[PDB]
Design an enzyme around this catalytic site. Structure first.
Site, PDB file in Angstrom:
ATOM      1  N   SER A  28     -11.659  22.554  -8.289  1.00  0.00           N
ATOM      2  CA  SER A  28     -10.692  21.970  -9.206  1.00  0.00           C
ATOM      3  C   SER A  28     -10.673  20.451  -9.041  1.00  0.00           C
ATOM      4  O   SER A  28     -10.303  19.944  -7.984  1.00  0.00           O
ATOM      5  CB  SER A  28      -9.317  22.575  -9.015  1.00  0.00           C
ATOM      6  N   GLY A  29     -11.081  19.740 -10.102  1.00  0.00           N
ATOM      7  CA  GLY A  29     -11.154  18.286 -10.096  1.00  0.00           C
ATOM      8  C   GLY A  29      -9.908  17.646 -10.685  1.00  0.00           C
ATOM      9  O   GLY A  29      -8.841  18.287 -10.605  1.00  0.00           O
ATOM     10  N   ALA A  30      -9.853  16.461 -11.038  1.00  0.00           N
ATOM     11  CA  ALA A  30      -8.662  15.739 -11.456  1.00  0.00           C
ATOM     12  C   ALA A  30      -8.252  16.178 -12.860  1.00  0.00           C
ATOM     13  O   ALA A  30      -7.065  16.241 -13.172  1.00  0.00           O
ATOM     14  CB  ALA A  30      -8.921  14.254 -11.401  1.00  0.00           C
ATOM     15  N   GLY A  32      -9.340  19.149 -14.494  1.00  0.00           N
ATOM     16  CA  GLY A  32      -9.200  20.604 -14.700  1.00  0.00           C
ATOM     17  C   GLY A  32      -9.563  21.407 -13.451  1.00  0.00           C
ATOM     18  O   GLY A  32      -9.998  20.846 -12.448  1.00  0.00           O
ATOM     19  N   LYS A  49     -13.631  26.070 -17.530  1.00  0.00           N
ATOM     20  CA  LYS A  49     -12.741  25.005 -17.100  1.00  0.00           C
ATOM     21  C   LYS A  49     -11.440  25.066 -17.898  1.00  0.00           C
ATOM     22  O   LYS A  49     -11.462  25.019 -19.130  1.00  0.00           O
ATOM     23  CB  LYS A  49     -13.405  23.640 -17.299  1.00  0.00           C
ATOM     24  N   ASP A 164     -22.319  14.438 -17.426  1.00  0.00           N
ATOM     25  CA  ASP A 164     -21.104  13.750 -17.839  1.00  0.00           C
ATOM     26  C   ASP A 164     -21.469  12.693 -18.876  1.00  0.00           C
ATOM     27  O   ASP A 164     -22.650  12.471 -19.140  1.00  0.00           O
ATOM     28  CB  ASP A 164     -20.403  13.058 -16.665  1.00  0.00           C
TER      29      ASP A 164
END
Length: 337
Positions: A28-30, A32, A49, A164
């Site tokens: 879990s990133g910033a 999602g 996500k 990205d």
């Protein structure tokens, strides 16, 4: 049309179409949280996500819309694509959650580069694919700005996707955006490609700076100090004067720095790693370089459809941003697989 089912994973509800089975958290990133799953329709493993608080402010609502617009637009073999997007909401009035589905990406490029020299044929293929991807991205008037090995996925067949879009490390960042020269274009990403290629060839990071200051010094050691021609293109006097302070340094012979390397590789690197972004080689130009002779085919290096970014300059209330996102979700059509 699809049936949804609900379950608890981590500390929140996940409500997804029944096609997605066997969900298990990966991280879990910033922005999602991400679950791996098995898609029973296509028979693939996928990453699901769930965006975090997508409409918490105008900043975040506009960010959600921006990203969803870009992910939907990008349809290219060397660029991450969107398999699915969905909401469990059956109306705009109940709309809160947004889920993005993508292929479960394998290792990034760092994993492959265990501080060892890749073979030239390996480097050719990887850099070819990055440039092919960048040509597509740049043709949609998009710049990445933070391209690095960790933003590149490679599978077991050495097929590469850019992960990205730039919506920790400064080692790969172009100097004109580091030093705020206000003199840049899409070739900022080409600088990054040059840093990555050099590393793949030598097994070592090209410009491992400890900080902003040391970064610049390392760079000017290799490429030399800016000529008068470039000095007068730099707008701010602060950036201009800062450059004028440092002592003169000659451009080094890259053949001595990359000893034993394919001479065509050295020549391409010399065109990639130049300070003046007006003279830096573009993606389309690099694809036509003799280094990629065996891979290059102009009719198999496509450009993107025109990309409408007029929303960037609009000032809307928060419910409008959410409404626009909702439209993009419900009107999503899967790519022809």
């Amino acid at each position: 049309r699809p049936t949804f089912y609900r379950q608890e994973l981590n500390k929140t509800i996940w409500e997804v179409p029944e096609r997605y089975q066997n969900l298990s958290p990966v991280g879990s990133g910033a922005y999602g949280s991400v679950c791996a799953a098995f898609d029973t329709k296509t028979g693939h493993r996928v990453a699901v996500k769930k965006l975090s608080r997508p409409f918490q402010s105008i900043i975040h609502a506009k960010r959600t819309y921006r990203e969803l617009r870009l992910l939907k637009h990008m349809k290219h073999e060397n660029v991450i694509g969107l398999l699915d997007v969905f909401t469990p909401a059956r109306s705009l009035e109940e709309f809160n959650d947004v889920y993005l589905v993508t292929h479960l990406m394998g290792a990034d490029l760092n994993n492959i580069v265990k501080c060892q020299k890749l073979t030239d044929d390996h480097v050719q293929f990887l850099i070819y694919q990055i440039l092919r991807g960048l040509k597509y991205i740049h043709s949609a008037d998009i710049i990445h700005r933070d391209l690095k090995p960790s933003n590149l996925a490679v599978n077991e067949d050495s097929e590469l996707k850019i992960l990205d879009f730039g919506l920790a490390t400064r080692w790969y960042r172009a100097p004109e955006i580091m030093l705020n020269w206000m003199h840049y274009n899409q070739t900022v990403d080409i600088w990054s490609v040059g840093c990555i290629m050099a590393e793949l060839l030598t097994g070592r990071t090209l410009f491992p700076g400890t900080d902003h200051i040391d970064q610049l010094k390392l760079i000017l050691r290799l490429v030399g100090t800016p000529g008068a021609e470039l000095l007068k293109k730099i707008s701010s006097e602060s950036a201009r004067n800062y450059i004028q302070s440092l002592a003169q340094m000659p451009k080094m012979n890259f053949a001595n720095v990359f000893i034993g390397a394919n001479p065509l590789a050295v020549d391409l690197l010399e065109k990639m790693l130049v300070l003046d972004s007006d003279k830096r080689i573009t993606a389309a130009q690099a694809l036509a370089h003799a280094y990629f002779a065996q891979y290059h085919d102009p009719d198999d290096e496509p450009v993107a459809d025109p990309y409408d970014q007029s929303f960037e300059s609009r000032d809307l209330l928060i419910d409008e941003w959410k409404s626009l996102t909702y439209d993009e979700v419900i009107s999503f059509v899967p790519p022809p697989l």
